[PDB]
Coordinates of C-alpha atoms and ligand atoms in Angstrom, one line a residue:
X1 CA 74.4 -95.6 -133.3
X2 CA 73.4 -92.2 -134.5
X3 CA 71.0 -93.8 -137.0
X4 CA 68.9 -95.3 -134.2
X5 CA 69.0 -92.1 -132.1
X6 CA 67.7 -90.3 -135.2
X7 CA 65.0 -92.9 -135.8
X8 CA 63.8 -92.9 -132.2
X9 CA 63.4 -89.1 -132.2
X10 CA 61.5 -89.1 -135.5
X11 CA 58.1 -88.7 -133.9
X12 CA 59.3 -85.6 -132.1
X13 CA 60.5 -84.1 -135.3
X14 CA 57.2 -84.9 -137.0
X15 CA 55.4 -83.1 -134.1
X16 CA 57.8 -80.1 -134.4
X17 CA 57.0 -79.8 -138.1
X18 CA 53.2 -79.5 -137.4
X19 CA 54.0 -75.9 -136.5
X20 CA 54.9 -75.2 -140.1
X21 CA 52.3 -77.2 -141.9
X22 CA 49.1 -76.4 -139.9
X23 CA 47.2 -73.1 -140.7
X24 CA 46.7 -71.9 -137.1
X25 CA 50.0 -73.2 -135.8
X26 CA 51.9 -71.5 -138.6
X27 CA 50.6 -68.1 -137.4
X28 CA 52.2 -68.8 -134.0
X29 CA 55.6 -70.0 -135.4
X30 CA 55.8 -67.1 -137.9
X31 CA 55.1 -64.5 -135.2
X32 CA 57.6 -66.0 -132.8
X33 CA 60.3 -66.5 -135.4
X34 CA 60.1 -63.0 -136.9
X35 CA 60.2 -61.4 -133.4
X36 CA 62.9 -63.6 -131.8
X37 CA 65.1 -65.0 -134.6
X38 CA 65.3 -62.3 -137.3
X39 CA 68.3 -60.5 -135.9
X40 CA 70.4 -63.7 -135.9
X41 CA 69.7 -64.2 -139.6
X42 CA 72.3 -61.6 -140.8
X43 CA 74.8 -62.8 -138.2
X44 CA 74.6 -66.4 -139.4
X45 CA 74.8 -65.3 -143.1
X46 CA 77.8 -63.0 -142.5
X47 CA 79.4 -65.9 -140.6
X48 CA 79.3 -68.2 -143.6
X49 CA 80.4 -65.4 -146.0
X50 CA 83.3 -64.5 -143.7
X51 CA 84.3 -68.1 -143.5
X52 CA 84.1 -68.6 -147.2
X53 CA 86.3 -65.6 -148.1
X54 CA 88.8 -66.4 -145.3
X55 CA 89.1 -70.1 -146.4
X56 CA 88.9 -69.8 -150.2
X57 CA 90.0 -66.2 -151.0
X58 CA 87.0 -65.5 -153.3
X59 CA 83.3 -64.8 -152.8
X60 CA 81.0 -67.8 -153.3
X61 CA 79.3 -68.2 -156.7
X62 CA 76.2 -70.0 -155.3
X63 CA 74.2 -70.3 -152.2
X64 CA 71.6 -73.0 -151.7
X65 CA 69.2 -72.3 -148.8
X66 CA 67.5 -75.3 -147.2
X67 CA 64.1 -74.7 -145.6
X68 CA 64.1 -71.2 -147.0
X69 CA 60.8 -70.1 -145.6
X70 CA 59.4 -66.9 -147.2
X71 CA 62.8 -66.1 -148.7
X72 CA 64.2 -63.6 -146.2
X73 CA 67.7 -65.1 -146.3
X74 CA 67.7 -65.0 -150.1
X75 CA 66.5 -61.4 -150.0
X76 CA 69.4 -60.5 -147.7
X77 CA 71.9 -62.2 -150.1
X78 CA 70.2 -60.4 -153.1
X79 CA 70.9 -57.1 -151.4
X80 CA 74.6 -58.0 -150.7
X81 CA 75.4 -59.6 -154.1
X82 CA 74.1 -59.3 -157.6
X83 CA 76.1 -62.1 -159.3
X84 CA 75.4 -65.0 -156.9
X85 CA 73.2 -67.9 -158.0
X86 CA 70.6 -68.2 -155.3
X87 CA 68.4 -71.2 -154.7
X88 CA 65.9 -71.9 -151.9
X89 CA 63.8 -75.0 -151.1
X90 CA 61.0 -75.4 -148.7
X91 CA 58.2 -78.0 -148.3
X92 CA 55.6 -75.2 -147.5
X93 CA 53.6 -74.1 -150.6
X94 CA 52.6 -70.9 -148.7
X95 CA 56.2 -70.1 -147.9
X96 CA 57.3 -70.6 -151.5
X97 CA 54.5 -68.6 -153.0
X98 CA 55.5 -65.7 -150.6
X99 CA 59.2 -66.1 -151.6
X100 CA 58.3 -66.0 -155.3
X101 CA 56.2 -62.8 -154.9
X102 CA 59.4 -61.0 -153.8
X103 CA 60.4 -60.9 -157.5
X104 CA 64.1 -61.6 -156.8
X105 CA 66.5 -63.2 -159.2
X106 CA 66.5 -66.6 -157.5
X107 CA 65.0 -70.1 -157.9
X108 CA 62.4 -71.3 -155.4
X109 CA 61.4 -74.9 -155.1
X110 CA 58.5 -76.4 -153.2
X111 CA 59.5 -79.9 -152.2
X112 CA 61.0 -81.9 -149.4
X113 CA 64.7 -81.0 -149.2
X114 CA 65.3 -84.8 -149.6
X115 CA 64.4 -84.2 -153.3
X116 CA 67.0 -81.4 -153.9
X117 CA 69.1 -83.2 -156.6
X118 CA 66.0 -83.2 -158.9
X119 CA 66.2 -79.4 -158.9
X120 CA 69.9 -78.5 -158.6
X121 CA 72.7 -80.2 -160.6
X122 CA 75.5 -77.5 -160.5
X123 CA 77.6 -78.0 -157.4
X124 CA 77.1 -75.4 -154.7
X125 CA 79.7 -73.3 -152.9
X126 CA 77.5 -72.8 -149.8
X127 CA 74.6 -74.8 -148.5
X128 CA 72.8 -73.2 -145.6
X129 CA 70.5 -74.9 -143.1
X130 CA 69.3 -72.3 -140.7
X131 CA 67.1 -73.0 -137.7
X132 CA 65.3 -76.0 -139.3
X133 CA 67.5 -79.2 -139.1
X134 CA 65.3 -80.7 -136.3
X135 CA 62.2 -80.5 -138.5
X136 CA 63.4 -83.0 -141.0
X137 CA 62.0 -86.5 -140.9
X138 CA 65.3 -87.9 -142.4
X139 CA 68.1 -85.5 -141.4
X140 CA 71.0 -88.0 -142.1
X141 CA 69.6 -88.8 -145.6
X142 CA 69.3 -85.1 -146.3
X143 CA 72.9 -84.3 -145.2
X144 CA 74.3 -87.3 -147.3
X145 CA 72.4 -85.9 -150.3
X146 CA 73.7 -82.4 -149.7
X147 CA 77.3 -83.5 -149.5
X148 CA 76.9 -84.8 -153.2
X149 CA 76.1 -81.2 -154.2
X150 CA 79.1 -79.6 -152.6
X151 CA 81.6 -77.9 -154.9
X152 CA 85.4 -78.5 -154.6
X153 CA 85.6 -75.4 -152.4
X154 CA 82.5 -75.3 -150.2
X155 CA 80.7 -75.7 -146.9
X156 CA 77.4 -76.7 -145.4
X157 CA 76.6 -74.4 -142.4
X158 CA 74.0 -75.6 -140.0
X159 CA 72.6 -73.6 -137.1
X160 CA 69.9 -75.1 -134.8
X161 CA 68.4 -75.4 -131.4
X162 CA 70.2 -77.5 -128.7
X163 CA 67.7 -79.8 -126.9
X164 CA 69.5 -79.1 -123.6
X165 CA 68.6 -75.4 -123.9
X166 CA 64.8 -76.0 -123.5
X167 CA 64.6 -74.5 -120.0
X168 CA 66.2 -71.2 -121.0
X169 CA 64.6 -71.4 -124.4
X170 CA 61.1 -70.9 -122.9
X171 CA 61.9 -67.5 -121.5
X172 CA 61.0 -65.7 -124.8
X173 CA 57.6 -67.3 -125.1
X174 CA 54.9 -64.6 -124.6
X175 CA 51.8 -66.9 -124.8
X176 CA 50.7 -70.4 -124.0
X177 CA 50.7 -71.2 -127.7
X178 CA 54.4 -70.0 -128.1
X179 CA 55.3 -72.0 -125.0
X180 CA 53.8 -75.1 -126.6
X181 CA 55.5 -74.3 -129.9
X182 CA 58.9 -74.0 -128.2
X183 CA 58.5 -77.1 -126.1
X184 CA 57.8 -79.1 -129.3
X185 CA 60.7 -77.4 -131.1
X186 CA 63.3 -78.1 -128.4
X187 CA 62.1 -81.7 -127.9
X188 CA 62.7 -82.4 -131.6
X189 CA 66.3 -81.0 -131.4
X190 CA 69.6 -82.7 -131.1
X191 CA 72.1 -82.2 -128.3
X192 CA 75.7 -81.1 -129.0
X193 CA 76.8 -84.7 -128.4
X194 CA 74.3 -86.1 -130.9
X195 CA 75.1 -83.4 -133.5
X196 CA 78.8 -84.1 -133.3
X197 CA 78.3 -87.8 -133.8
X198 CA 76.0 -87.1 -136.8
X199 CA 78.6 -84.8 -138.5
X200 CA 81.4 -87.3 -137.8
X201 CA 79.4 -90.2 -139.4
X202 CA 78.4 -88.3 -142.5
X203 CA 82.0 -87.0 -143.2
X204 CA 84.3 -89.8 -142.0
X205 CA 84.1 -91.7 -145.4
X206 CA 84.2 -88.6 -147.5
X207 CA 87.6 -87.6 -148.8
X208 CA 88.6 -84.0 -148.4
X209 CA 85.5 -83.3 -146.3
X210 CA 85.8 -82.3 -142.6
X211 CA 83.5 -81.0 -139.9
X212 CA 83.4 -78.7 -136.9
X213 CA 80.8 -78.3 -134.2
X214 CA 80.5 -75.8 -131.4
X215 CA 78.0 -73.8 -129.3
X216 CA 80.0 -70.5 -129.3
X217 CA 78.1 -67.6 -130.7
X218 CA 80.2 -67.0 -133.8
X219 CA 80.0 -70.1 -135.9
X220 CA 80.6 -72.3 -132.9
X221 CA 84.3 -71.3 -133.0
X222 CA 85.9 -70.6 -129.6
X223 CA 87.1 -67.0 -129.1
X224 CA 90.7 -68.2 -128.7
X225 CA 90.6 -70.2 -132.0
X226 CA 92.5 -69.1 -135.2
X227 CA 89.2 -69.5 -137.1
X228 CA 87.4 -67.0 -134.7
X229 CA 90.2 -64.6 -135.2
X230 CA 90.0 -64.8 -139.0
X231 CA 86.1 -64.5 -139.0
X232 CA 86.1 -61.4 -136.7
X233 CA 88.5 -59.5 -139.0
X234 CA 85.6 -59.3 -141.6
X235 CA 84.0 -55.9 -141.6
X236 CA 80.7 -57.2 -142.9
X237 CA 80.4 -59.6 -139.9
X238 CA 81.3 -56.7 -137.6
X239 CA 78.6 -54.5 -139.1
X240 CA 75.9 -57.3 -138.7
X241 CA 76.9 -57.6 -135.0
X242 CA 76.6 -53.8 -134.6
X243 CA 72.8 -53.8 -134.3
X244 CA 70.1 -52.1 -132.1
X245 CA 70.5 -51.9 -128.4
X246 CA 67.5 -54.3 -127.8
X247 CA 68.7 -56.9 -130.4
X248 CA 72.2 -57.0 -128.9
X249 CA 70.7 -57.7 -125.5
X250 CA 68.3 -60.3 -127.0
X251 CA 71.4 -62.0 -128.5
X252 CA 73.2 -61.9 -125.1
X253 CA 70.2 -63.5 -123.4
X254 CA 69.7 -66.3 -126.0
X255 CA 70.6 -69.9 -125.1
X256 CA 73.6 -71.2 -127.0
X257 CA 72.8 -72.7 -130.4
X258 CA 74.3 -75.6 -132.2
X259 CA 76.7 -74.5 -135.0
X260 CA 77.9 -77.2 -137.5
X261 CA 80.1 -77.0 -140.6
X262 CA 80.7 -79.6 -143.2
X263 CA 83.7 -78.3 -145.2
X264 CA 85.0 -79.6 -148.6
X265 CA 88.4 -78.6 -149.9
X266 CA 89.6 -80.7 -152.8
Ligands
SAH1 N1 61.9 -81.6 -145.2 C1 61.8 -80.2 -145.4 N2 62.3 -79.7 -146.6 C2 62.3 -78.4 -146.9 N3 61.8 -77.5 -146.0 C3 61.4 -77.9 -144.7 C4 61.4 -79.3 -144.4 N4 60.9 -79.4 -143.2 C5 60.6 -78.2 -142.7 N5 60.9 -77.3 -143.7 C6 60.7 -75.8 -143.6 O1 61.6 -75.3 -142.6 C7 61.2 -74.0 -142.2 C8 61.5 -73.7 -140.8 S1 61.2 -72.1 -140.3 C9 62.2 -71.1 -141.4 C10 63.7 -71.4 -141.2 C11 64.5 -70.5 -142.1 N6 65.7 -71.2 -142.7 C12 65.1 -69.4 -141.2 O2 66.3 -69.0 -141.2 O3 64.3 -68.7 -140.4 C13 59.7 -73.9 -142.6 O4 59.5 -72.9 -143.6 C14 59.4 -75.3 -143.0 O5 58.4 -75.4 -144.1
5D7_2 C1 66.6 -67.7 -128.3 C2 66.1 -68.7 -128.9 C3 66.4 -69.0 -130.4 O1 65.2 -69.6 -131.0 C4 65.2 -70.1 -132.3 O2 66.2 -69.9 -133.0 C5 64.0 -70.8 -132.8 C6 62.9 -71.1 -131.9 S1 61.7 -71.9 -132.9 C7 62.7 -71.7 -134.4 C8 62.1 -72.2 -135.7 N1 63.0 -71.6 -136.8 C9 62.0 -73.7 -135.8 C10 63.2 -74.5 -135.2 C11 63.4 -75.8 -136.0 N2 64.4 -76.6 -135.4 C12 64.3 -77.4 -134.4 N3 63.2 -77.7 -133.8 N4 65.4 -78.0 -133.9 N5 63.8 -71.1 -134.1

């Protein structure tokens, strides 16, 4: 039962979340995240944009960003599109105040993502959950709720740490505080096996809604898959991958992440 696995790892997830809700700890997590995770942001975004265009033959009308932090993902989208409805939600008041100060045409909500349907009624073409799934107290509840908000042509794209990657994941820590941070983050994470079970359970009773999970770099799609072939044809995704020397090497050295899709096609 995936429910019990999720309930029994709840304390770990609460602990991981202290790194985003405590004043001193938040300084450590921000510094690490900006240094080590910023370059993957554009890759993950262009992956879902390439997927959407390939699958549905139009650009999305709306992106909902779950755990949006200081609004960096929404800023990126704002620079790529003008006529996209952008929404971000984060339970950190400090993060949301920072996002609002950007002065972007976007809606920012300060609340547990569990409460999203109080703030968004129009169905969403893309729901993005980037590098934060393992922080949620009630991840299955959040996903079930998000599925209600999916448009007839839509996807949830989830990218997160794999618990089995802890050992390799510690390599990028540069201080004892960062080491402690990463240990807590990986301990709260799911494994590939657990993540697959979760996405199966939340989609199996939902008509026209499917899932895919993988640990391959580009959306978890194997390099021999038809999906990978289609994604890699997209010049915007190519451009995002064509980054600095140091960031390409960082991306090469990174442990494999979990990549999950919940896809609705009515
Ligand atoms: N239950 C919840 N609802 C909304 N946001 C949450 C949450 N639990 C944690 N978060 C937020 O998740 C973020 C994790 S770090 C930022 C992740 C961001 N999506 C990125 O791509 O880098 C933090 O800002 C934290 O406040
Ligand atoms: C190369 C290493 C890749 O490292 C990361 O992507 C990373 C490390 S810590 C972090 C934060 N965004 C919080 C992660 C929240 N998720 C889980 N704990 N599962 N992201």
